[PDB]
């Protein structure tokens, strides 16, 4: 159904017509019969030995070695083909088109980059990729199954004694299914076993009751496996059936049926792998630092609104200046040329290894009195040493970046370094002083010589202890920096004081930095929760950041790495060179564990629209997708299904924007009925949980919601053979138009709060559902079954007693008391959690309640007070009537006094872990979220947790804020 | 007489937050200072904040038994005396690495007078003037920032399409250079012996190629003209945002200084959320 012009290899052109679902073999076969009716058809050869070549919509000249693709999958620019003979590696041209489809950009664009740091990274990162493929391939085929199906366990084998008491005498009852007959005879075997036996001792009893191992255990309904030896109660599945009163269902498979669905995969080195005097130390120069500003190419300023412009510079070591800033002279807006040496109060040998130049072009309006009005136009940052330890010399050109929305400072020391890859932007010319040689930064044997050149009981061990346990954003005076630095040899006794002793160093003094290096080299390791603080933007030094990465690689478990993977991907934007120890650590982990590799993929992929990071993250996606094995085909199917839904919902947003739910809901059933939409959106793994495999779509139930941005309710079958024990429908919201990064962070914090409360002796049950961000304001939301908003229950039930009558109607008699104690232990968690995070505008459209009484909050949006940078709670009298069991005096019962004791206990246990929550927000400052831009925006958490008060003055601050949110409306 | 009360000093600010002092020492000469209450909110602590070397230094004032000062030999009668001892002697007498004097005190009555007419009948109207003009600017700014990112994304689509034409045109022209030298001097001239092959097979073919080659060069040229026009409106929307951005910092400062000198100080008025 389209004319395709075909350029034969004898200078002749043809107009061939084909149907749009035709493979390349079909069109190629059809071409050399229509071509024998043309003049020089005896020069040609047989159809083989030829292939096609064309241009794609990403401006790529593409050779189609894969003859089974079809005419509509090609993404051509113009409808034409061309016959040539095949030059190139055939198995390698096929992998490059799969990799380029997953990450969203052609792999050929990386070859056309001339930066030698970029080309060093590409071939030097292939060394990590090879050492992992040898590691997940060592003891086979077991080691290959552990990679694909890794154990989802807890970090700790010991049960909280309040969880242990839900097991009678340390016994668990399990139901072990066995499919025996060829006609699916489902046998069940109920057992009772110690909570700490291993899965080879569980199987050993299921065989005696039915009358190396030959069998594995699987979770019925979701293809999770128990392969590695652990106590049974440490797997998160068995651990979550002990604290919910449910029964675990396990099915007894055979090893040969799992080992045989593992497709083998091999790693081969790419094409670019095969490809490819007198020096002065930094510490022998004797001169101040100076830089020359030549001119700016163009700036977009009006002549009748702005008087002058100038260039503002500064030297920085991670957010702090190393000297006072220096301006140029103010010139007229139409002649930006300065030709001016600027002089800095930094001496050349006193520059630290992570110094940067930060500059902006600024305008002066003034024009009214004396208080001049200054405003930045464009910013840019430069490293003063490059990735080979060389000080930068000679002329330089730099394209600048637009000011971030919501910023008014004059410099931007937290932005990225490098030129704007767009080139029709303001370009500023620079000039660095030349010292008749190549100048290198010293090496650490010369630095240890200098430390030993510039180089007893006490009773104030109690001042070092008080400083050690203080907030990561607490004030430090000048007297305490002098005190910390002079007692620096006894601080190795309080190993967790290292973050505070590093902010006492003078970094513009090479004598003090040399002594600090010798002191980090012998430092005792610290907990991975405390080493993650050393990886944000206040600690740029590379000797400090390698100490932090070494503490993670010894003490961070896969369980906690999954917990903290969002933050470990944002601090990649802070590293100053492409090749570094944090990127080698994270890539090693994602190539030995697909649960980690799955989410590592989607967190980098969702930020490829960002031009400040796209080349960094693109080179790293290229390296993962080249060694991930057979999992690149699963990812390719998830990218095709997501791109179908983005294209579909774009139609509903700007072509059906005004229509009604009848004409739109019929367009949707049209579009989804097409047989190509039906193959993309059916039979793929879920991105929210890659253990949940989606099946046949259920089109009758899919619908267009009436929420803000009109998301998609979608519904799949669970194709598992024992799906009936677990759920049977995967229901997912697709949303296109909302930023889902504040919700991922909110839902991650709540899952950390709950774990602190569970390990204290409290049972406040949270519901942190699934949420994933896949691109620029597009994402996926897990749906909870058997749940209603408070607003549905109030309308269906029609008053203030509606919710309590609904909740008794659903469960009668002996189980009315368990429905009341679960509504109460749930409402106390979301009451404390939403106060600490600053989450407001809670109403009956964004609070939901299950059938069994449990409660949860949804659709958070803005978390800190981003609006004001009181509205008493309106459902207060409705939840009081539930908490007091429908009594008459709600606020005076013994049941309401236990509601308050649980909130007080939960508030004071989060306040004991305030440093963990300060750091998780600090690691997100360059993320790009508008609520979280400076260290001034994290100050909200220090107010609600009352960190400057004492423990009794804080609790009275909580009681006084809750009383102000009482009955209200 | 230079030892007045600490509550009437110009450089004393009471209880203001740490992040509200960072908005007053931002890009000021080395030697600017003020004093406030310590963050603990226990009275008699008095942290001093000094600007020096591009940074904000933070120095504690101790209170042994009616004395004041920096170190343990507290030898001053009061804070106002201590501040005056160092407005004439450099701070190198305390720390040699801190060679600077207290030069430029951040006064409270220099900028608080930026507002005038402490009536409530006046400033309510002057607050109404600014709160209307301020938020009318933000309705004109954040509209432009919306048109700015949309014009940026359409510039980038066009530039990729121009690269798609350049690679497409590059293979036709190499396809007509094999039409002749590969075939049209050694098969056409050799066998020209009264054939009907010439005018149809070779000529008619090669003349529908050139009709197709130039039709591609006419769509590239039509797109290249909408990119020049599209890159000119993108610089006019970036000039206008550069002249609105300065006007809109001045309004917020002249507008917020009203809310915190008459409506919250001159009268405890819950009408401020009702004025607006
Ligand atoms: C039954 C009930 C009572 C209250 C408050 C009004 N009463 C107390 C709470 C704890 C204690 Cl220990 N005592 C009291 C007391 O009044 O004595 C609630 N408060 C919230 N809030 C409050 C708040 C403040 C600031 N930002 C966000 C938020 C969300 N929610 C989301 C609730 O479901 C809720 C439920």
Can you offer a commentary on this structure?
The complex is a heterodimer of chains A (969) and B (276). Among the domains of chain A are: 2-87, Ubiquitin-like (UB roll); 152-259, Roll (Ubiquitin-like (UB roll)), CATH 3.10.20.90; 286-438, C2 domain (Immunoglobulin-like); 787-969, Phosphatidylinositol 3-/4-kinase, catalytic domain (Phosphatidylinositol 3-kinase Catalytic Subunit, Chain A, Domain 5), CATH 1.10.1070. Chain A is built from 35 helices and 31 strands. In chain A, strand 27 (771-775) and strand 28 (778-782) form a beta hairpin. The relative contact order of chain A is 0.06. By secondary structure, chain B is an alpha+beta fold. Chain B has 2 domains: 18-110, 2-Layer Sandwich (SHC Adaptor Protein), CATH 3.30.505; 120-180 and 209-275, Helix Hairpins (Orthogonal Bundle). Chain B contains 6 helices and 4 strands. Chain B has a 4-stranded mixed sheet with strand order 3-2-1-4, with no helix packed on it. In chain B, helix 3 runs antiparallel to helix 5 (233-259). The radius of gyration of chain B is 37 Å and the shape is elongated. At the A-B interface, strand 14 and helix 14 of A face strand 3, helix 3, helix 4 and helix 5 of B. The structure holds ligand UEX. The ligand Cc1cc([C@@H](C)Nc2ccc(Cl)nc2C(=O)O)c2nc(N3Cc4ccncc4C3)n(C)c(=O)c2c1 binds next to helix 30, helix 31, helix 32 and helix 35 of chain A.
List keywords for this structure.
heterodimer; A: 969 residues; alpha+beta; Ubiquitin-like (UB roll); Immunoglobulin-like; 31 strands; globular; B: 276 residues; SHC Adaptor Protein; Helix Hairpins; 2 domains; four-stranded mixed sheet; 6 helices; 7% strand; elongated; binds the ligand Cc1cc([C@@H](C)Nc2ccc(Cl)nc2C(=O)O)c2nc(N3Cc4ccncc4C3)n(C)c(=O)c2c1; Phosphatidylinositol 3-kinase regulatory subunit alpha (chain B); lipid metabolism (chain A)
């Amino acid at each position: 159904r389209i004319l395709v012009e075909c350029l034969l290899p004898n200078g002749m052109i043809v107009t061939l017509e084909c149907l749009r679902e035709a493979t390349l073999i079909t069109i190629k076969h059809e071409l050399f019969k229509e071509a024998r009716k043309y003049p020089l058809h005896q020069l040609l050869q047989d159809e083989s030995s030829y292939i096609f070549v064309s241009v794609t919509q990403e401006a790529e000249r593409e050779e189609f070695f894969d003859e089974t693709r079809r005419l509509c999958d090609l993404r051509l620019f113009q409808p034409f083909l061309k016959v040539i003979e095949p030059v190139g590696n055939r198995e390698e041209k096929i992998l490059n088109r799969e990799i380029g489809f997953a990450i969203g950009m052609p792999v050929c664009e990386f070859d056309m980059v001339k930066d030698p740091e970029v080309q060093d990274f590409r071939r030097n990162i292939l060394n990590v990729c090879k050492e992992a493929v040898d590691l997940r391939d060592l003891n086979s085929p077991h080691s290959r199954a552990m990679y694909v199906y890794p154990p989802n366990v807890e970090s700790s084998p010991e049960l909280p004694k309040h969880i242990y008491n839900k097991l009678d005498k340390g016994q668990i009852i399990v139901v072990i299914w066995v499919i025996v007959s060829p006609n699916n005879d489902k046998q069940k075997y109920t057992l009772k076993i110690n909570h700490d036996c291993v899965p080879e001792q569980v199987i050993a009893e299921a065989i005696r009751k039915k009358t190396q191992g030959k069998y594995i255990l699987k979770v019925c309904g979701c293809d999770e496996y128990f392969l590695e030896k652990y106590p049974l109660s440490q797997y998160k599945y068995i651990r979550s059936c002990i604290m919910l009163g449910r029964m675990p269902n396990l099915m007894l498979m055979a090893k040969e049926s799992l080992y045989s669905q593992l497709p083998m995969d091999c790693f081969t080195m790419p094409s670019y792998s095969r490809r490819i005097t007198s020096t002065k130390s930094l510490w022998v120069i004797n001169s101040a630092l100076r830089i020359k500003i030549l001119c700016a190419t163009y700036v977009n300023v009006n002549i009748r609104d702005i008087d002058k412009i100038y260039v503002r510079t500064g030297i920085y070591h991670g957010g702090e200046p190393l000297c006072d800033n220096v301006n140029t002279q103010r010139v007229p807006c139409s002649n930006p040329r300065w030709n001016e040496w600027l002089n800095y109060d930094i001496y050349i040998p006193d520059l630290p290894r992570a110094a940067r130049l930060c500059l902006s072009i600024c305008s002066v309006k003034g024009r009214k009195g004396a208080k001049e009005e200054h405003c930045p136009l464009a910013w840019g940052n430069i490293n003063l040493f490059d990735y080979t330890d060389t000080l930068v010399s000679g002329k330089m050109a730099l394209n600048l970046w637009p000011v971030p929305h919501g910023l008014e400072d004059l410099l931007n020391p937290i932005g990225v370094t490098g030129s704007n890859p767009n080139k029709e932007t303001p370009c500023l010319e620079l000039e660095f002083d030349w010292f008749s040689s190549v100048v290198k930064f010293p090496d650490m044997s010369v630095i240890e010589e200098h430390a030993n050149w510039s180089v007893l009981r006490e009773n104030d061990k109690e001042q070092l202890k008080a400083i050690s346990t203080r907030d990561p954003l607490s004030e430090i005076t000048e007297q305490e920096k002098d005190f910390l630095w002079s007692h620096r040899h006894y601080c190795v006794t309080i190993p967790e004081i290292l973050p505070k002793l590093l902010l006492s160093v003078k970094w513009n003094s090479r004598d003090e930095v040399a002594q600090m290096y010798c002191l980090v080299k012998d430092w005792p390791p610290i907990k991975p929760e405390q080493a993650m603080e050393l990886l944000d933007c206040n600690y740029p030094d590379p000797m400090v950041r390698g100490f932090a990465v070494r503490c993670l690689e010894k003490y961070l478990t896969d369980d906690k790495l999954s917990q903290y993977l969002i933050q470990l991907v944002q601090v990649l934007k802070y590293e100053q060179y492409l090749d570094n120890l944090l990127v080698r650590f994270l890539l090693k982990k994602a190539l030995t564990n697909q649960r980690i590799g799955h989410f590592f993929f989607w967190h980098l992929k969702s930020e490829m629209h960002n031009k400040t990071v796209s080349q960094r993250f693109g080179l790293l996606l290229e390296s993962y997708c080249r060694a991930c094995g057979m999992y690149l085909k699963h990812l390719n199917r998830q990218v095709e299904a997501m791109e179908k839904l983005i294209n579909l919902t774009d139609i509903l947003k700007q072509e059906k924007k005004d229509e009604t739910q009848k004409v739109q809901m019929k367009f949707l059933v049209e579009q989804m009925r097409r047989p190509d939409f039906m193959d993309a959106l059916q039979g793929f793994l879920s991105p929210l949980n890659p253990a949940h495999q989606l099946g046949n779509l259920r089109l009758e139930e899919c619908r267009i919601m009436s929420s803000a941005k009109r998301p998609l309710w979608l519904n799949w079958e669970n194709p598992d053979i024992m799906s009936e024990l677990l759920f049977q429908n995967n229901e997912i919201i697709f949303k296109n138009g909302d930023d889902l990064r504040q919700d991922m962070l909110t839902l991650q914090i709540i899952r950390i709060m709950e774990n602190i409360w569970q390990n204290q002796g409290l049972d406040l049950r949270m519901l942190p559902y699934g949420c994933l961000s896949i691109g620029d304001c597009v994402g996926l939301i897990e749906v909870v079954r058997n749940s209603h908003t408070i607003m549905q229950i109030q309308c269906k039930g029609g008053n203030s007693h509606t919710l309590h009558q609904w909740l008794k109607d659903k469960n009668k008699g002996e189980i009315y008391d368990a429905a009341i104690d679960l509504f109460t232990r749930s409402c106390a968690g979301y009451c404390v959690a939403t106060f600490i995070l600053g989450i407001g505008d809670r109403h009956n459209s964004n609070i939901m309640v299950k059938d069994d009484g449990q409660l949860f909050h949804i659709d958070f949006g803005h978390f800190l007070d981003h609006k004001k940078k009181r509205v008493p709670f309106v459902l207060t009298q409705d939840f009081l009537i539930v908490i007091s069991k429908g009594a008459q005096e709600c606020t005076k019962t013994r049941e309401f006094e236990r509601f308050q004791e649980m909130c007080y206990k939960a508030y004071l246990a989060i306040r004991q872990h305030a440093n963990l929550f300060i750091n998780l927000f600090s690691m997100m400052l360059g993320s790009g979220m508008p609520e979280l831009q400076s260290f001034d925006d994290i100050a909200y958490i220090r107010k609600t947790l009352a960190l400057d008060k004492t423990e009794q003055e804080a609790l009275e601050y909580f009681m006084k804020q809750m009383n102000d949110a009482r009955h209200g409306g | 007489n230079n030892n007045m009360s600490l509550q009437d000093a110009e450089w004393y600010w009471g209880d203001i937050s740490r992040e509200e002092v960072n908005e007053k020492l931002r890009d000021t000469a080395d030697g600017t200072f003020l004093v406030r209450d310590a963050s603990t909110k226990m009275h008699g602590d008095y942290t001093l904040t000094l600007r020096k070397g591009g940074n904000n230094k933070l120095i504690k004032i101790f209170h042994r038994d009616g004395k004041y000062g920096f170190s343990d030999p507290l030898t001053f009668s009061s804070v106002v005396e201590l501040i005056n001892h160092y407005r004439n002697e450099s701070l190198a007498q305390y720390n040699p690495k801190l060679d600077v004097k207290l030069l430029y005190p951040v006064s409270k009555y220099q900028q608080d007078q930026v507002v005038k007419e402490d009536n409530i009948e006046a400033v309510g109207k002057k607050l109404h003037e600014y709160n209307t003009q301020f938020q009318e600017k933000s309705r004109e700014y954040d509209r432009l920032y919306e048109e700015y990112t949309r014009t940026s994304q359409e510039i980038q689509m066009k530039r990729t399409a121009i690269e798609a034409f350049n690679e497409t045109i590059k293979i036709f022209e190499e396809q007509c250079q094999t039409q002749e030298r590969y075939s049209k001097e050694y098969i056409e001239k050799f066998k020209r012996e009264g054939n009907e092959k010439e005018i149809q097979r070779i000529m008619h073919n090669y003349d529908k190629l050139k009709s197709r080659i130039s039709e591609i060069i006419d769509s590239r040229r039509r797109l290249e003209e909408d990119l020049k026009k599209q890159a000119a409106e993108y610089r006019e929307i970036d000039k206008r945002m550069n002249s609105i951005k300065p006007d809109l910092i001045q309004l917020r400062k002249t507008r917020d200084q009203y809310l915190m000198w008459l409506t919250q100080k001159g009268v405890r008025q819950k009408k401020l959320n009702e004025w607006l």
